[PDB]
Amino acid sequence: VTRIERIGAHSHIRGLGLDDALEPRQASQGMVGQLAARRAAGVVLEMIREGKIAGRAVLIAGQPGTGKTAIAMGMAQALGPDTPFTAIAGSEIFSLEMSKTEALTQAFRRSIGVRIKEETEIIEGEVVEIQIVGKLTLKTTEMETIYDLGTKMIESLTKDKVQAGDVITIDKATGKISKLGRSFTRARDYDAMGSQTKFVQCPDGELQKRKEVVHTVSLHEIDVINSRTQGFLALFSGDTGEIKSEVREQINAKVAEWREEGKAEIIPGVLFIDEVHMLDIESFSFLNRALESDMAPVLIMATNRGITRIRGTSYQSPHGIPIDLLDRLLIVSTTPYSEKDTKQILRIRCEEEDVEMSEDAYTVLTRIGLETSLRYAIQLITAASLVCRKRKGTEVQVDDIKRVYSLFLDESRSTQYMKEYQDAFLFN
Amino acid sequence: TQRIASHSHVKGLGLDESGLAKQAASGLVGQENAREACGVIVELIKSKKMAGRAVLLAGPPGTGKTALALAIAQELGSKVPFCPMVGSEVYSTEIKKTEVLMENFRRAIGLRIKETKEVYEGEVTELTPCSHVIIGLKTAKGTKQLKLDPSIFESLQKERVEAGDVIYIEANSGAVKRQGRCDTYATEFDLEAEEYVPLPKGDVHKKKEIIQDVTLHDLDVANARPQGGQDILSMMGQLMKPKKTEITDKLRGEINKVVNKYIDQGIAELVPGVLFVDEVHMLDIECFTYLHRALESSIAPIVIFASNRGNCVIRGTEDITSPHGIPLDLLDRVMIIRTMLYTPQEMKQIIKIRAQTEGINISEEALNHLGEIGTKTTLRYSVQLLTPANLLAKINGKDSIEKEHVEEISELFYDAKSSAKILAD
Amino acid sequence: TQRIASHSHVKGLGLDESGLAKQAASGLVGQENAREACGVIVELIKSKKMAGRAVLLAGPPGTGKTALALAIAQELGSKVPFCPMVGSEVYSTEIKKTEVLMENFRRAIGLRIKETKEVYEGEVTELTPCETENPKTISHVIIGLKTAKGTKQLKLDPSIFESLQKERVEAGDVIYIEANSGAVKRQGRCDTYATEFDLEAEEYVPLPKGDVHKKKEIIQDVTLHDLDVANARPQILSMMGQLMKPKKTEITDKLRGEINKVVNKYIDQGIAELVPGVLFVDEVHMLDIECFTYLHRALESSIAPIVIFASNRGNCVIRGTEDITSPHGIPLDLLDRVMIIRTMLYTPQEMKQIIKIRAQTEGINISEEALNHLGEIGTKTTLRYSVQLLTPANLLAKINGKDSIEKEHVEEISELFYDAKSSAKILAD
Amino acid sequence: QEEKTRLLKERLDQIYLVNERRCSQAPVYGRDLLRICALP
Amino acid sequence: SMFDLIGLENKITRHEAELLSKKKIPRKLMEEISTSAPAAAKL
Numbered sequence A: 001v002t003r004i005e006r007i008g009a010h011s012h013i014r015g016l017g018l019d020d021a022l023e024p025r026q027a028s029q030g031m032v033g034q035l036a037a038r039r040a041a042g043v044v045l046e047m048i049r050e051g052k053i054a055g056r057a058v059l060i061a062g063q064p065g066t067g068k069t070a071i072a073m074g075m076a077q078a079l080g081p082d083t084p085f086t087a088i089a090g091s092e093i094f095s096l097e098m099s100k101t102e103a104l105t106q107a108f109r110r111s112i113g114v115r116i117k118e119e120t121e122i123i124e125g126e127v128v129e130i131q132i133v134g135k136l137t138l139k140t141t142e143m144e145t146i147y148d149l150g151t152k153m154i155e156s157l158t159k160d161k162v163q164a165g166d167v168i169t170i171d172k173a174t175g176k177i178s179k180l181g182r183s184f185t186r187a188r189d190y191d192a193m194g195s196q197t198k199f200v201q202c203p204d205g206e207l208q209k210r211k212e213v214v215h216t217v218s219l220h221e222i223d224v225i226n227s228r229t230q231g232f233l234a235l236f237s238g239d240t241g242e243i244k245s246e247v248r249e250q251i252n253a254k255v256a257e258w259r260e261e262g263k264a265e266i267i268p269g270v271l272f273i274d275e276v277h278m279l280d281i282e283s284f285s286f287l288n289r290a291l292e293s294d295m296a297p298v299l300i301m302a303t304n305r306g307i308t309r310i311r312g313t314s315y316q317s318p319h320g321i322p323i324d325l326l327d328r329l330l331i332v333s334t335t336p337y338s339e340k341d342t343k344q345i346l347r348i349r350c351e352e353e354d355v356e357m358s359e360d361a362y363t364v365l366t367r368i369g370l371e372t373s374l375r376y377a378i379q380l381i382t383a384a385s386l387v388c389r390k391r392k393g394t395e396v397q398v399d400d401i402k403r404v405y406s407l408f409l410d411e412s413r414s415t416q417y418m419k420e421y422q423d424a425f426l427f428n
Numbered sequence B: 001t002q003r004i005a006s007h008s009h010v011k012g013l014g015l016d017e018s019g020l021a022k023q024a025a026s027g028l029v030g031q032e033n034a035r036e037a038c039g040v041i042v043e044l045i046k047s048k049k050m051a052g053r054a055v056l057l058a059g060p061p062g063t064g065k066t067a068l069a070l071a072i073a074q075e076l077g078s079k080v081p082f083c084p085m086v087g088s089e090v091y092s093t094e095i096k097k098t099e100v101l102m103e104n105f106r107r108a109i110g111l112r113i114k115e116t117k118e119v120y121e122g123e124v125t126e127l128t129p130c131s132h133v134i135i136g137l138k139t140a141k142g143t144k145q146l147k148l149d150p151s152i153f154e155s156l157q158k159e160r161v162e163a164g165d166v167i168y169i170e171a172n173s174g175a176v177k178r179q180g181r182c183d184t185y186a187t188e189f190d191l192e193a194e195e196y197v198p199l200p201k202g203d204v205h206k207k208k209e210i211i212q213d214v215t216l217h218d219l220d221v222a223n224a225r226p227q228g229g230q231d232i233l234s235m236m237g238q239l240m241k242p243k244k245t246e247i248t249d250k251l252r253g254e255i256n257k258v259v260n261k262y263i264d265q266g267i268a269e270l271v272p273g274v275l276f277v278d279e280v281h282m283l284d285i286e287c288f289t290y291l292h293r294a295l296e297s298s299i300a301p302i303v304i305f306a307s308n309r310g311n312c313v314i315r316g317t318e319d320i321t322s323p324h325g326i327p328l329d330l331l332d333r334v335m336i337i338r339t340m341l342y343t344p345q346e347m348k349q350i351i352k353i354r355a356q357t358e359g360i361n362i363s364e365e366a367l368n369h370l371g372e373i374g375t376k377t378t379l380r381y382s383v384q385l386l387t388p389a390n391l392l393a394k395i396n397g398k399d400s401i402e403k404e405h406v407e408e409i410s411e412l413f414y415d416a417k418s419s420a421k422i423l424a425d
Numbered sequence C: 001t002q003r004i005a006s007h008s009h010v011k012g013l014g015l016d017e018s019g020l021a022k023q024a025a026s027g028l029v030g031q032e033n034a035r036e037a038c039g040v041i042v043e044l045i046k047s048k049k050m051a052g053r054a055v056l057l058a059g060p061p062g063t064g065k066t067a068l069a070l071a072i073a074q075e076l077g078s079k080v081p082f083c084p085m086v087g088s089e090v091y092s093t094e095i096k097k098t099e100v101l102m103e104n105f106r107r108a109i110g111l112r113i114k115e116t117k118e119v120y121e122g123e124v125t126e127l128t129p130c131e132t133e134n135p136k137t138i139s140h141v142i143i144g145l146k147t148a149k150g151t152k153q154l155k156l157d158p159s160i161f162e163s164l165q166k167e168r169v170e171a172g173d174v175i176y177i178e179a180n181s182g183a184v185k186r187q188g189r190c191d192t193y194a195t196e197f198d199l200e201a202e203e204y205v206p207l208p209k210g211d212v213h214k215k216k217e218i219i220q221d222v223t224l225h226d227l228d229v230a231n232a233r234p235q236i237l238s239m240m241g242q243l244m245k246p247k248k249t250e251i252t253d254k255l256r257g258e259i260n261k262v263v264n265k266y267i268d269q270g271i272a273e274l275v276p277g278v279l280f281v282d283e284v285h286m287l288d289i290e291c292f293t294y295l296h297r298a299l300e301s302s303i304a305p306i307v308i309f310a311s312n313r314g315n316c317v318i319r320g321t322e323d324i325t326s327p328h329g330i331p332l333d334l335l336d337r338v339m340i341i342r343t344m345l346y347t348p349q350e351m352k353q354i355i356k357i358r359a360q361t362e363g364i365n366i367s368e369e370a371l372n373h374l375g376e377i378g379t380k381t382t383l384r385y386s387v388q389l390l391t392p393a394n395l396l397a398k399i400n401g402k403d404s405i406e407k408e409h410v411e412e413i414s415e416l417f418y419d420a421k422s423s424a425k426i427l428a429d
Numbered sequence D: 001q002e003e004k005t006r007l008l009k010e011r012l013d014q015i016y017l018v019n020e021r022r023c024s025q026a027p028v029y030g031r032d033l034l035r036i037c038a039l040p
Numbered sequence E: 001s002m003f004d005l006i007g008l009e010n011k012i013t014r015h016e017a018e019l020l021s022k023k024k025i026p027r028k029l030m031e032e033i034s035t036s037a038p039a040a041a042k043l
């Protein structure tokens, strides 16, 4: 069945393909070539796992199509889902709801997980009888007990309309009641059931259990929850506005106290900002200070620009980043692919897309990709597969590649054809 | 429909079984290579295997780029989602451009949800709370006695359900709706402010397997803000100004997980569709740079772009010129289908099809004259002259368009080139 | 705290008693003149005499400007409010830039409130009224309070009988009574009467410890901005305000003047003590002309904190102007209101000292030859780059089963990762 | 009795399906998470 | 409603959801309940 997630541009990548010594293996876990860059990404991944040093910034820089985002996806896959990995595009911070600095702060705080443990003492059981002073009788498969009821407790039992046969949980620390459902029985079967009705088995073991529960949240979620009375709604709608510095400072201090008490754990993650050259000078200046915080995640960036104009200024800088921020980060450089690496990337893409191709087809597709671009060849893989299926074939041949090459143009051929008829296109 | 639109004649791509474009079929004339490419694109979309692959329709104005996108939409069908948008629609004043693009991406993913509705419907003959609730429903096929969960009694009281009223009860959700009074009591009073509804015809218990198509964006906006809540804050939220909001990535991920769970259960089916972004040259550099990641996603649909610009400056950038007004980086992520200028014969065939679609009878001489005019100015101008020419023909008491009417209309209305020449003088 | 940041080794200005900077102390190396001037600035802050005095740290990148500011902050302690800001933060979407600046100014003025409360708390043991003939009439209400220390009887005013019945105080209930108002507050049944069979949570409380009568001192630290925010929007109007987004508001000068008056009244009454602090504005060159102009008036206020600016832009065009260049991206008018402290480039020896201190703080064992190689790398490239190589080289060494960084690990890490200049060279080619 | 027991079986199947769907789904955050994440 | 998430924030808890998932009545127990279909003294 077609699940929500389908074959995308990075579906074949399932990690960095490194060994225990971080030596890059050729054609491992979907990664081909980029040996030096993959080794550097492994070193950065070890830094992220260690977590000791906050605010380390890494810029993955290279030519278009050299696997920068592929390396980022490999890092995200190799890193466990427990550790946060916030992947955004540079253009996601330009919002009408909040300033750019607020958006970068929220991206920073979303990339730091905090794991909070909590112990509670609850009484869970099936209600046998309730008498309106008051008395309540509960039972499990192993025990039966009767309690005396206070004024607030009898009020809570009445308001929730707890009836005999229900399964309820009452927290001794707070005295609140929650109805988990009603136990099914010979007499409680009905022709229609209410929306809230849930059938549940009688609880096992002892009534008064001691719980240990661990909640995994992030600093941004804590900020939003503490932003206003119904702040957790903004965890859905995103209408968080600009969270005040008071709330953030009080949360940083409370989390520090929690970690000192052993209640919470901090899991520093990664903030990947692809296409980082969309950030403006204000964003870069904010990042220069934001990375100096001890609650800063490890920052990874990707760009393909050369000596280009910094957005928001008239200055030109390498990678479109001012040298203040470039001095604060390490640069990993990608390398253009060889013929062998191109062919192996095409083979892995065919294996993911479930396409069978003849060897001559592999040679011609590799030549096309070397001459035009790797992405164009990847697209022509599925194009030729479709054209072959329309032909009632079972293996993609060179003729199908020539067919799709004639049907779908690349940038160069399309540009040449546009220039040939430039009198018809607008605003040349 | 009833009103003739600029593409009402386009009913498909006109391909044969071998995937080759017929010269004139399904309202499309010429553009053989582009129709065959759009055929391969339709096969890609129907495959439901790939995500986030993108296509750029390139060529001069009036070369059928939008017509071809609508032909793809026709070939897919109504079940497959097809979200059209224009590049200038990203400049919302309520949400960021990337949010508008993400919303349109989610709209193009459909989710067909399959369910059996069970409903008990009939006239109420008895309502006695005992615990449990006993209700008696009557229909044209008989009377049935039902035992209801006591939680439905509150719903029955809220709906003010009494004996003799026609109501329905959902077996899965217990929702009760009082759909008026039974028409048998229409004579109980001569003047009552009540809505009488006929007694249901079928059985009291009705079963129907149904399907509903929803988009992931619909789930996103349903979970964006609480609805139907009886709490005072929910009532105020019902009252407040509805605004688009920058729905968070975490909610989208959770919705994806739940949809995946229900796809695994078998009660939902994914229907990936197409997002059509016309005039993609209008997007700014920020939108294109976000679209890089958006297309690289594994949840994205097939996105069809259309650009008519030449080597123009990318918007939101000073003097950086890229082909089609699209950065080369995004161009490397798309497949380019080239549309060509029409030959005079193809323009004549298009004019004929447009006239036939508008219901206009045109003589051979008028058709030849219109073809000559279109050759001299534009196809769209010749095609637009058909309706006024028919109007003048009907005013002159004629059911067919002659060359005199086309001459008169082309004298009354100028083309863009003629106005430009006049204003140059 | 536990995680290691770029400035986690800065523990203060390494100054002696005579105000001179040691060559290397408290994690700082060199910058003797700049540390001495920062020392005079720290004395200025601690003197509390002056308001609105501005100092500009100016110098090349990686010359310790932010390290010196955080060293000043460490010297001042945690009592003095030190508010870090970056110039990019003024561009808010909820309020005007001048409001952001004024809010950050008021964040750097601290106020310490001292509250002394007298309370009589304990478990109630008797509530006997004292009947009398009026000159049934009661002249006193005797309440007996029990604590773990002992029992006390209070001859309370008869009017307290209304509050006792309002609070439903009964024998065996734990209460506390404040000396001033004389109103009773009930806090639950004493836990000595709680059984394991009855279910209530809030209605039980342990017997108070300590003497029945207590004198409690509560000290709270606030900023003038905290008071501003509190008085600007107090917490059905509350329901609508909490449902809608509580945006920042452009707090009026009227409210700030009223709050200044209230704080002066508290300082006269002795309830409160002012702790004026420091606002640090890094990357101040991100401010626009309107912000700098506002800062002209703000620094002339008698209420303003001491502000520390930092810039490295050199002769650069002022943001929000066209072609108006200024020595630091700051208009010359503001520069006349600030003292400038220059920071100077480091020698290779100072770079080696900083690298060693960083390695110590990160917990990294570095060999002498490895330290020399990394220093020589840092004399090329940048200091920041050489520091950043420390932990990846330590990890590379740990992979190879070495407890200390060897020179080969530094060489390999340098071969893997490149600096801004090497990348510029690759881009040029 | 075959039709009646078939109808009962169908009711039981629908009960099972609805109860499985209701009990299958966990909240994204929950009450306890919000309570524990709240500042004093 | 199977996709309604925000409605669960005021209705259930993660630990309660785990309990509900663990203790849901299986088919055989309902079949048995359909097939089959304490005086206190103060000592």
Ligand SMILES: Nc1ncnc2c1ncn2[C@@H]1O[C@H](COP(=O)(O)OP(=O)(O)O)[C@@H](O)[C@H]1O
Binding pocket: A009, A010, A030, A031, A032, A033, A034, A062, A063, A064, A065, A066, A067, A068, A069, A070, A071, A304, A345, A348, A349, A374, A375, A378
């Ligand atoms: N190291 C790699 N191994 C395998 N495939 C790669 C690699 N790098 C790039 N690709 C392929 O090319 C595309 C990814 O290129 P990408 O990383 O987006 O380039 P850029 O650096 O411009 O972002 C994917 O379709 C993927 O199949």
Ligand SMILES: Nc1ncnc2c1ncn2[C@@H]1O[C@H](COP(=O)(O)OP(=O)(O)O)[C@@H](O)[C@H]1O
Binding pocket: B006, B007, B027, B028, B029, B030, B031, B059, B060, B061, B062, B063, B064, B065, B066, B067, B068, B350, B353, B379, B380
């Ligand atoms: N291949 C075609 N066959 C038939 N009619 C066409 C064709 N291409 C365009 N038309 C008609 O001419 C009009 C202009 O074409 P259009 O699709 O708008 O071009 P573009 O979208 O590239 O500007 C269409 O609305 C349609 O009515």
Ligand SMILES: Nc1ncnc2c1ncn2[C@@H]1O[C@H](COP(=O)(O)OP(=O)(O)O)[C@@H](O)[C@H]1O
Binding pocket: C006, C007, C010, C027, C028, C029, C030, C031, C060, C061, C062, C063, C064, C065, C066, C067, C068, C354, C384
């Ligand atoms: N004189 C010094 N002694 C010790 N550490 C220093 C010194 N100068 C800079 N550093 C450290 O080296 C790095 C330089 O960054 P920073 O001080 O922020 O420079 P900038 O002046 O560019 O803001 C910081 O980690 C800082 O703690």
Ligand SMILES: [Mg+2]
Binding pocket: A068, A069, A274, A302
């Ligand atoms: Mg990329």
Ligand SMILES: [Mg+2]
Binding pocket: B065, B066, B067
């Ligand atoms: Mg069009």
Ligand SMILES: [Mg+2]
Binding pocket: C065, C066, C067
């Ligand atoms: Mg600094």
